[PDB]
């Protein structure tokens, strides 16, 4: 039954026992009889109609990138937004959660928490502890299915073999390392990077912020910057993604030839609940085939229409109006145009000029099976695995034309706009920056399937839980002196981004500008005279600690809208070198400057990079093209710095021994697990 | 404990005891104390030093194809062979058990049962019984662990989608449909013949009867035909498979280009117990690519010595010994030179001039991880795969040309090898001949992991059933008419073969001959006047019914052998048409003709096709070009048959309804399940 | 269904399974074509 | 037509076949002789020699009167690698190209 | 040699022996106890300076066939990084072993490798597959080093 709603604390509640053990759901109040209580009589009436048709199986998984799949996601989700009160909402929500496919119910009833006004001060758990098989490897899964099978009987050797304890009778934990028995390339030296549960629960919740379905005036999200945000995600994602392979010594990443091949193949080692894992594909695909010709087309139709109106500067939409390219603030008009959100005339419905869901084809094994229940998603089918194909990456890169076309196109910025007179930075200093691999625990007790009497109590009678290595970096500050001759508000913009290039070669500001990363950015208030800004890394805007566990009702009274629009503590810097990786960080202070609303940004608290602070482009001053002549003012400064990286694994265990013979515990380990190291024995 | 031995029905269960539950494994006979108690003391000391450094662990996967795992295999094999007596035998295998990987474990005692001469009159449990990782989908495995875990808690709704079922609260029953989801190219079309467990099972009997690194004088196969009943167990599985494609109207199979592409992918659909699957394959791979164009070119290195040679008449050995290759009787030898086996000096030691375990580089993934224990397999690395791979169907087609070339530089058979003077068939009639789907339950409990309290019992409190759908036939006569001058013991041999090609040309004899299979052979006593010969499907040579459970102790006296080289009766017949597919049944009956000795092969139990009944080349009348005047006999007749299809699910279902509106319970079920269709409700 | 007259109008009691076609790249659409194998 | 493949699905067979025959001859060229399926030895050393490569290359080397088959070289492959296909050869219907006949080949 | 490869992987033996490179080779006398062997990298064999200008007529009396088989000491090793590249030193003793003379090479100063040392081939102990049950006997030794 829907769990009664009395104040936030029990919202809360009501929305972990919906999202709990979805794979095994487990009403008095009739749907069909209650269509008053919403606000949209249409939309009850489609979903009741194609309930009534049917539905995806909940045996079934549900694929984001599927048209009728998102049909009916899309009418799940109308079905909910339009409940007149909460009440409603949940009792919609618990007839639903026992009804309909599990994924789908999930993906909807997360859109609406996201976009309903009165779920504000709401904390759901994070992705990966409703569905773990989209975020753990088939192995660990595998492993947890074989604990539970035999209620914790391996016996001592597999144990020891898999890294599996049992903690006080009551925790399963099994170690999780990546290992090389999946390698297909060097890209995957950047696994732990791109593989991150944080990153892609990131991508998960930007695309949750801003859905591309949603493109009507009546939603509140169409007041704020969406199409800018997006794309500026993008853009620094991939720029950290550059930050990161430099770390390793390797060149930033080309954009991918559709008329040529796919060198860079993925093993994607997700395993779904169906039973099926994602397939597997070879190195050296050729990527346009005979099987998906007419969505290459497609996909054209597309590239054709943005550039070419980039070129003219102006677009002709179906529904008959006329987009201007011409002004820098069209910039917002161009990426809901791109990445979705775009507005046409009231009385317009249908597909528009720009279709979507097409990039996935050009990376799949097949559209026999696409637009049924029973199709198998692939990695980029998914917005909660798409950054672990390097594909997706390519692809990214290819469409990242688009906006430095348009830039590229605006005038330069001038001297005056760069410049605040009056206020010059002296100097910028920082600690030692370290990064270094640690323990992270993932509850993933939601992948296991429960009995009679543990559907009673409504919990597994053990936890399982999954010790994963992750990236993390030690606290550090940054301290800016600035010298001001009036007192006056500032924003203030602190980028880290490259030094040298893979061949050694000491990078111009012009080719390092896309690769620079806007680590922070804040208001401040200077005064007359010296000004010490002290910033430490613990308040850096919008970057969130790790994830806690949803069960211990997650042991701030803000973490509710900091999660998420949050990024990980964890991936903040890039990995270093045992010897110091150069980078380069970036401090510019400028005045405040200055239909969207700001206030629907502030009020929902999505407060993404400087959106609430001020009204400059994102990615300013590195968005266009610079001319050195109008560049360096006095309100700039430049620091090299040094980024180094440390191993734990020893720096604890220290005896006096060599271990220059001594083997892994398993051979397809790396040098980043020390610790699994065992002198070579006999038996 | 290893269980003591009385008799042979204790032996038995003594060997079903060592192959039960092997997943969990679970002393005072010491092994290093014990090295009197074999044969060789060489081998005894080899496997010590090498299990003393270590060896495959039992958390990863045995491959057959890998060097490192198939000589660690070979040691276990060598210590396990040479026990004195049966006693030492079952000790040394109990202590096996429990120290080393289960596969291994498994592969070496099979193939010392298969080649131990007091292991005579033993039946041993079906491999996929054993190991139905190798042979069962994974998603069914999947839905047993999740029945598994939750002890059959599953709500009616995914029951009934999944068509689980629980029968006496005893045994657990999932539906085994194939579909089409893991679709890849129209191959996949005679999913049901290629993937069929008995054909996987036959070639790895096949192999373990005459294994290539059994190459040594002291084994009696060394005596027996191996190498041309290989080759001829090779060539009538393409030849079946060739009518199997006729009869989905399909052109027979080109050979592989390693200079090109392969075409055909595959989805392996299996689950290791390692938590990992079979990579996919996507259609148009190239084959030759700079991570294997070393083994590319070790591949060559084969070719080049054994074509040439066939066309030179003789092959030099590094062994120091030159092998003709100008008779007809030198086929065997060119065999073993080809598929191992090949006896070289006794002083000789090290790898011969033919390197093995090759082909399977140009369809892998990579070569990155070869020679380790991490190393994740492809369909082609397993005999209990290989045939479910059209890329090996491609290899054996590109292989067989060595044969051809062979037999091609022979003499055509003459007319009075073809004769039988005095010897004359009148006519050859047959029953009705049908086909039809039927379903299989495959025991699988094996797969799932058991408690402490299961462990105790040595048995798991539920039962877990894969009800599979296979083809089967139903039972026909053969009715031959002889005419006889004198009384004569005779050979009769009955082939099965193509009536038309795809493009509906009346096949000719000379491109007819490579695709006949031989389906019949027998001796017979002919006597003066006229014979009436009967032959019923039921006692067709080497013709097996379907394997019994082993748990029910297989509930004949002659079993024991019977299935190790039997073939089944289900693919007896190619799949008809519901019209009457096109087919010629051949008959030919000639005299008893005539270092290999046919008492070993007598004594072991190893009479395939009619070795244990002539000398005549395996393959005879077809294995050689065919001069059309010294052909057409008296003695031999052809005679058109028609094989059709029947439908038994709606044949049972009779009712007075139309089903012209309904739809399947799944979409992607095919017409060989009407039994699924549902008629559209209204929810 | 598809029906084949060739043969529905030669009706006589023989079997065929050794007749050989008068051209060698006619179909199984030109039964009619059928001749015994002959010796000149 | 123009810019034809000449090595394809349809010919690979004949393809390797036709190899057998260019490995058998140009060793033997390095080698200095050559071993024939009938049992004999051809010497490749002298200039004399030069007529006896010729009836191994392009036919009318006499092997052992006792023998009979096909020797180590095979003939009639090259036309292969510029038919339009193989499916009709060997028959009394296949339709020659002009690498076919003797009388068309230098066209 | 190496210590790991270009995916960070712990490398074996097998997968090593091809990328051993044999930067010294010597004779030495053992004595009953405990010896202490030095060897500086000046006096590594076959290992030569840069060569002098000939300008200034060559400004040793040996260098003339030392500078004919002489690899450079400026590529002794190779470049490591700021924070220590990881490699890996292998150390091997064996006995004295044993158409072709050794005086010829002696004569002519010809002397590559242990050519004149002694009658084991080239790349001994690496240049065959290797058997890790007959290997890693207690005269050979391995050693992680830092770059
Ligand atoms: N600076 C971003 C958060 C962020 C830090 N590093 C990133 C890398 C990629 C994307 C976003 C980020 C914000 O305030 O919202
Ligand atoms: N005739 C074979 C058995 C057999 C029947 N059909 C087959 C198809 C393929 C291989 C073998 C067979 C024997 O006697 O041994
Ligand atoms: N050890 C070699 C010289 C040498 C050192 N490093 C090398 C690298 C490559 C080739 C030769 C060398 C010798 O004694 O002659
Ligand atoms: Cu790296
Ligand atoms: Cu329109
Ligand atoms: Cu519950
Ligand atoms: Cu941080
Ligand atoms: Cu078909
Ligand atoms: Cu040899
Ligand atoms: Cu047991
Ligand atoms: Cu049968
Ligand atoms: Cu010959
Ligand atoms: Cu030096
Ligand atoms: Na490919
Ligand atoms: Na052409």
């Not at 597997?280 to 054209?300: D, G, P």
């Not at 145009?337 to 419905?349: A, P």
């Not at 509850?443 to 290595?469: F, G, P």
Request: glycine residues 4%; aromatic residues 12%; contains cysteine.
């Amino acid at each position: 039954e829907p769990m009664k709603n009395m104040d936030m604390k029990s919202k809360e509640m009501c929305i972990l026992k919906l999202m709990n053990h979805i794979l095994q759901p487990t009403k008095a109040w009739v749907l069909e009889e209650n269509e008053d209580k919403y606000m949209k009589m249409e939309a009850v009436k489609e979903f009741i109609n194609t309930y009534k048709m049917g539905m995806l199986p909940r045996g079934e998984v549900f694929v984001h990138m599927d048209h009728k799949h998102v049909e009916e996601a899309v009418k799940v989700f109308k079905l909910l937004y339009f409940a007149n009160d909460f009440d409603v909402f949940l009792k919609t929500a618990c007839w639903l959660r026992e009804r309909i496919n599990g994924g789908m119910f999930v993906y909807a009833l997360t859109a609406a928490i996201f976009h309903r006004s009165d779920c504000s001060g709401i904390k759901i758990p994070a992705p990966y502890e409703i569905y773990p098989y989209l975020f753990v490897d088939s192995n660990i899964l595998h492993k947890a299915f074989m604990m539970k099978m035999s209620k914790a009987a391996m016996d001592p050797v597999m144990k020891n073999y898999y890294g599996i304890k049992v903690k006080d009778n009551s925790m399963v934990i099994i170690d999780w390392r990546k290992g090389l028995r999946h390698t297909m390339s060097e890209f995957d030296r950047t696994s732990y990077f791109t593989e991150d549960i944080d990153l892609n629960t990131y991508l998960y919740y930007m695309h949750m912020s801003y859905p591309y379905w949603m493109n009507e005036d009546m939603y509140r999200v169409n007041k704020e910057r969406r199409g800018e945000a997006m794309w500026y995600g993008y853009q620094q994602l991939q720029a950290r993604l550059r930050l990161e392979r430099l770390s390793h010594h390797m060149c930033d990443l080309k954009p991918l030839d559709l008329d040529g091949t796919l060198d860079e193949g993925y093993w994607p080692k997700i395993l779904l609940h169906t039973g099926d894992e994602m397939p597997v594909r070879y190195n050296k695909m050729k990527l346009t085939n005979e099987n998906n010709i007419k969505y290459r087309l497609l996909l054209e139709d597309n590239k054709r229409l943005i550039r070419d109106g980039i070129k003219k500067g102006h677009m002709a939409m179906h529904d008959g109006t006329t987009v201007s390219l011409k002004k820098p603030d069209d910039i917002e008009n161009l990426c809901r145009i791109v990445l979705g959100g775009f507005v046409s005339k009231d009385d317009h419905k249908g597909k528009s000029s720009i279709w979507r869901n097409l990039a996935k084809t050009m990376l799949s094994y097949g559209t026999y099976n696409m637009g049924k229940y029973t199709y198998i998603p692939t990695a980029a089918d998914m917005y909660s695995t798409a950054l672990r194909d390097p594909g997706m990456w390519k692809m990214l890169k290819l469409i990242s034309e688009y906006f430095i076309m348009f830039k590229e196109m605006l005038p330069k910025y001038t001297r005056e706009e760069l410049d605040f007179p009056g206020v010059k930075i002296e100097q910028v200093t920082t600690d030692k920056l370290v990064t270094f691999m640690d323990e992270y625990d993932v509850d993933i007790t939601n992948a296991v399937y429960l009995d009679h009497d543990e559907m009673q109590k409504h919990r597994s009678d053990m936890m399982y839980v999954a010790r994963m290595h992750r990236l993390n970096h030690q606290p550090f500050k940054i301290t800016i002196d600035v010298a001001s001759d009036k007192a006056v508000e500032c924003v203030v913009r602190v980028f880290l981004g490259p030094k040298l290039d893979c061949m050694g070669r000491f990078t111009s500001v012009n080719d390092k500008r896309n690769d620079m990363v806007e680590i922070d950015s804040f208001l401040y208030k200077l005064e007359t005279g010296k000004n010490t800004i002290v910033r430490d890394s613990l308040e850096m805007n919008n970057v969130i600690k790790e994830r806690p566990w949803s069960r211990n009702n997650w042991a701030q009274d803000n973490w509710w809208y900091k999660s998420r629009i949050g990024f990980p503590h964890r991936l903040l810097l890039p990995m270093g070198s045992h010897g110091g990786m150069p980078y380069q960080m970036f401090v510019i202070v400028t005045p405040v400057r200055a239909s969207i609303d700001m206030n629907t940004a502030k009020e929902r608290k999505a407060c993404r990079w400087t959106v609430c602070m001020d009204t400059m482009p994102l990615g300013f001053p590195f968005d266009r093209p610079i001319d050195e002549t109008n560049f360096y003012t006095k309100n700039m400064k430049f620091h090299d710095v040094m980024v180094y990286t440390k191993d734990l694994a020893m720096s604890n265990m220290v005896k006096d021994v060599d271990m220059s013979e001594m083997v892994m515990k398993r051979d397809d380990l790396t040098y980043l697990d020390k610790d699994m190291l065992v002198k070579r024995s006999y038996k």
